[PDB]
Ligand binder design. Structure first.
Ligand SMILES: Nc1nc2c(ncn2[C@@H]2O[C@H](COP(=O)(O)OP(=O)(O)OP(=O)(O)O)[C@@H](O)[C@H]2O)c(=O)[nH]1
Ligand SMILES: Nc1nc2c(ncn2[C@@H]2O[C@H](COP(=O)(O)OP(=O)(O)OP(=O)(O)O)[C@@H](O)[C@H]2O)c(=O)[nH]1
Ligand SMILES: Nc1nc2c(ncn2[C@@H]2O[C@H](COP(=O)(O)OP(=O)(O)OP(=O)(O)O)[C@@H](O)[C@H]2O)c(=O)[nH]1
Ligand SMILES: Nc1nc2c(ncn2[C@@H]2O[C@H](COP(=O)(O)OP(=O)(O)OP(=O)(O)O)[C@@H](O)[C@H]2O)c(=O)[nH]1
Lengths: 235, 235, 235, 235
C-alpha cells in the first residue's frame, strides 16, 4: 500500500497495490522503500549488464527471503544474557525446505542457502504444452519427507500462474498441506495472483512488486523481461 | 507500537520504545519482526557458540545495513524495460564511505562490503585512559576526501555514547557535515541515544534494538555481553 | 601422481593415480595435499551432517574451479606498478561459460559464479532409460553463442561416463570445438576416465580424485554415495 | 621449483626464487600458475579500480589461506563411506587462531573466516615512531589462550620485516611457541625474508610472491604500492 516519497510511481501503481492488499489477505508486499526501488530499476533496465543484473538480483533475493521466512511459525523462548538477565525472545522450529521451479526459481536457491545453511532443496521442472499449452511436469526431485514440511516455493515471476499452480498441485498430491506453502516471488501480475488464490486460497505469497498487466506473449509489463535468460545469461 | 504480536516484549520495553520514537525524530528503529527477535535471542544467549554467534550477527548486520542505506539521498530515475516500456525508479547517491570504530565496529564492515563492493572504509580507534577513563583518539586512517561524503559510522553497541561522540568530534574536526553522519548501531541504551542527540542533534541513527538501561559496570541490559569479544573470539 | 605423507593411502591409490597420469595426457589431478584429503574425509564420511557436507563440498569446489580455470589460454600482458615499474603478467581468456549436468552438476555453478562474476551458465538434463539404460537428453538450455566459447562442463561424479559423454555429444553437435571443453570433476572411476578419452580424446579433464571401481549399481568405491542427493538433501 | 611457461617472468625473478628456496627451508611458495599470475597482474596494475582490486585480492587471499592451512599438523583418520567401505583420510588440528597486523593484515581476516568459520582473531597495531622510526606496539587484543594455539600471522606485505618481527616478538613474550607461527603473506622482499629468518628461524612463511628489492623509499619493487590504502580505499 505505502509508496515511498523519493521515487515517482508508475501509472495506477498505488491503486493496484492497495487493491491487492485488501482483496488478498494472504499476500504480503515488501515495504516499498527507496532501496528496493533502487535495486528494481537496475534489474529492470534493459541496459543493465549481466554481472550487475545478478549482483543486484542476488541482493534483492536476500531481502525477500528474510521477509518470507517471517511467515513461519514461532515459539516463545527465554534465554539468559552474559549479564545473567533474562531476555524473552523466540525460536524458529519448523521443519522446512525450499522448492524451486526449474531454472528461474533456482536463482533463489543460493539466497535461501545463504541464510539457511543446508536447507533441503527440491526441484520441479515444468514445461507448457506445445499444442494447447497446458503445464506438464517434466521432472522433479523432492525431499522424501516433504509432506511434513513447510515449503518455500521459489519462482521469481508470476504472470499467468500456470506454472506455480501446477507445481502446487503435485506438491499437494504428495501430501503437502496447502496452508504450509509459502510462495516467495519477486515480480507478479494481478491476474496471476487472483488465479493462485482462486485455486489455492490457503497458501501465502510474499512478493516484492506487483506490476500492471501481461502482454499477448504472457510477459509482465512494465515487467523485467525473461528473468531466467537474464540471470543465467542465455539471452 | 508496531511490535510483532507473536512474541512477548521485555518488561517495560514497549514503553521505552515509545519514548524514544517520540522524542528523537532522527532515530530509525528497524521493523521489530519475529524473525529479527529470533536472531537477537540467539546472539544475546550466553550459551551460543562462537560459530553460531558470528553467523547470525553477520546475518542481522546485513539487514541493518540495507535499512541504514535508506537514509541516503536518492535521485529519481527513469529507465526503459526489456518490454520497451518506461519504468520510474530511483538512483543511488554516490559520495559515501564506511567508518568503523576499531574492533567492535569492524565486524560490520563485512556486511557493508557485501552490499557495497569497493566502498571506502575508514578506521578510528578510540580508547579510554586506564586511569582517567576518558576517550582518547589513539589511531585513525580515513579517506582523504571524507569531508565531502556521507559517513556510515559503524559501532554495534551504544552504552554511554562516550566513544561514538568522541568519534563524531574528530570526524567534524576534519570537515564532515553533522547531518551526513548515519550512525548504524545494533543495540543501544536510552541514555546513550539521549547524549548523542544532545550534542549532535543533526546526525541520523539506525538501530535494531533499544534496551532498558545500563548496570553498575556500564553494560547495556538485558544486553548482549561484550560484542567485540564474542565476535572475534577474544573471550 | 604423487601423494602427501601426512595421511595413509588406500590400497593401490599411488598405483592407480600414476597409471591415469601417464596413460592420459589430458587429465589433471589436483595436488594431493593433506588439506584436500581432510576435506574428502568430511564429505565421504556417511556420518557427516548435511550442513557440513555442503560447506566442505562448496569449499573443495572453489579450489577445483580455480585449478580448472588454469587450463584456459593466456596472453602476455605488461602492466605498470604504482611504483612506476613494469611487471610482466598475463591476462586471461575472453570467452567462456559453464555448463552443468542437471542436479549434481548444479552444486558447482555457485563456485563458478563466485570467481567469475556473471558467467553464463548452461544446463543439460540427462536421464537414462529404464530398459536400454541409454542416456537421453531430457532438457537443455544453453547460451546462444556456445559454439565460440570454451565450456567448463560441470559434473561432480564420473562413474560410467555415459552421461558426461552424452553431454559432450550434444555440445559437439551444437558446434563446440571438442578441444575447448574442460570437464571439471570431483570424483572419478578409472573406467569413466578411459571411456571419456576413448570417445573424445581432445577434451581436458580436471579432477580432485580417482577411486578404484564401480559396483553393480554404478557407484564409485570407496566413492561418496549419491552426491546430488547428499548435497541437495533429497536423500 | 616450477614456473608456468605461459608467462614471461621478469629480470632475475627466477634467480631470486632459486636462492630463497635454497637458503630458506621454511618458506612455502605458492605454485606459480598462470591463474595466480593473472591475479597478481590485476592487483599490481596501478590502473585498476578499487572494486576490481578488492575482488581479485580476496580471491587470491582465498587460495593463499588454503595453502597455509596445509602447514598445520594433521592426524590420521578412518571413515566409513556410504558404500560401507573404509577410506583412509586425515583430521584437522584443533587449536588455531588468526592474528592481523592492524589494517593491512585485516584484509586477510575475511578470507580466513571464509574457510574457518568462527576462528578466533587477534589483532596487533604496530606503529613506527614519526621521528625515531622505531616499530612500536600501539594496540593489541589477542585470545586469552593464544599460547596454547598455532597462530596464522597475517600481513600482505614484507619489505624490511620490522613490523612483523615486532609482532612475533610480542607474541613470544606472551607465550606462543615460535615453531607454531605460520606467517601468511602475499608479497615479500628478499631482505624481509632474511631478517625474519635471521631472528626467528623456526617460523613458517607462506607467500604468493617475492619481488626483486626494496625502493629507496623502502617500497617492495616492482611491488604493488600500499596494500592497505588500495584495499580499504584510503589513498
Ligand atoms: N524456520 C527457520 N529456521 C532457520 C532459519 N535460519 C536458520 N534456521 C535453522 O534451520 C533449521 C530448519 O530446519 P531443518 O534443519 O531444515 O530441519 P531438518 O532438515 O529436519 O533437520 P535435520 O534432520 O538435522 O536435517 C532450524 O532448526 C533453525 O534453527 C530461518 O530463517 N527460519
Ligand atoms: N549510495 C549508494 N551507492 C551504492 C549502493 N550499492 C552500491 N552502490 C554504488 O556504489 C557507489 C558509491 O559511491 P562511491 O563508491 O563513494 O563513489 P566514489 O568513491 O567516488 O567512486 P570512485 O571514482 O571510484 O572513487 C555508487 O556509485 C553506486 O553505484 C548503495 O546501497 N548506496
Ligand atoms: N578466462 C578467465 N576469465 C576470468 C576469470 N576470472 C575472471 N575473468 C574475467 O571475466 C571475463 C569472462 O567474461 P565472459 O563472460 O566470457 O564475457 P562474454 O562471454 O563476452 O560476455 P560479455 O561481457 O557480454 O561480453 C574475462 O574477460 C576475464 O577478464 C578466470 O578465472 N578465467
Ligand atoms: N586446523 C583446521 N581446522 C579447521 C579447518 N577448517 C575448519 N576447521 C575446524 O575448526 C576448528 C579450529 O579450532 P578452533 O575452533 O579454533 O578450536 P577452539 O577455539 O579451541 O574450540 P572451541 O573453544 O569450542 O571454540 C577445528 O576443530 C576444525 O574442525 C582448517 O582448514 N584447519
Amino acid at each position: 500500500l505505502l509508496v515511498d516519497p523519493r521515487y515517482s510511481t508508475n501509472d495506477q501503481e498505488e491503486s493496484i497495490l492497495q487493491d491487492i492488499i485488501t482483496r488478498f489477505p494472504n499476500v504480503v508486499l515488501m515495504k516499498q522503500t527507496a532501496q528496493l526501488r533502487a535495486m528494481m530499476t537496475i534489474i529492470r533496465d534493459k541496459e543493465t549488464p549481466k554481472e550487475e543484473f545478478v549482483f543486484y538480483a542476488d541482493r534483492l533475493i536476500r531481502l525477500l527471503i528474510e521477509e518470507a521466512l517471517n511467515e513461519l511459525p514461532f515459539q516463545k523462548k527465554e534465554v539468559t544474557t552474559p549479564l545473567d538477565v533474562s531476555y524473552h525472545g523466540v525460536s524458529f522450529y519448523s521443519k522446512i525446505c525450499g522448492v524451486s521451479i526449474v531454472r528461474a526459481g533456482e536463482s533463489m536457491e543460493s539466497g535461501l542457502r545463504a541464510v539457511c545453511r543446508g536447507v533441503r532443496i527440491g526441484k520441479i521442472l515444468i514445461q507448457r504444452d506445445e499444442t494447447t499449452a497446458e503445464p506438464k511436469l517434466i521432472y522433479e526431485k523432492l525431499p522424501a519427507d516433504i509432506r511434513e514440511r513447510w515449503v518455500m516455493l521459489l519462482d521469481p515471476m508470476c504472470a499467468t500462474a500456470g506454472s506455480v499452480c501446477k507445481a502446487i498441485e503435485v506438491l499437494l498430491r504428495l501430501g503437502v498441506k496447502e496452508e504450509r506453502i509459502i510462495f516467495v516471488n519477486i515480480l507478479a501480475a494481478p491476474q496471476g495472483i487472483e488465479r493462485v488464490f482462486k485455486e489455492y486460497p490457503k497458501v501465502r505469497m510474499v512478493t516484492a512488486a506487483v506490476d500492471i498487466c501481461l502482454n499477448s506473449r504472457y510477459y509482465i509489463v512494465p515487467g523485467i523481461g525473461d528473468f531466467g535468460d537474464r540471470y543465467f545469461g542465455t539471452m
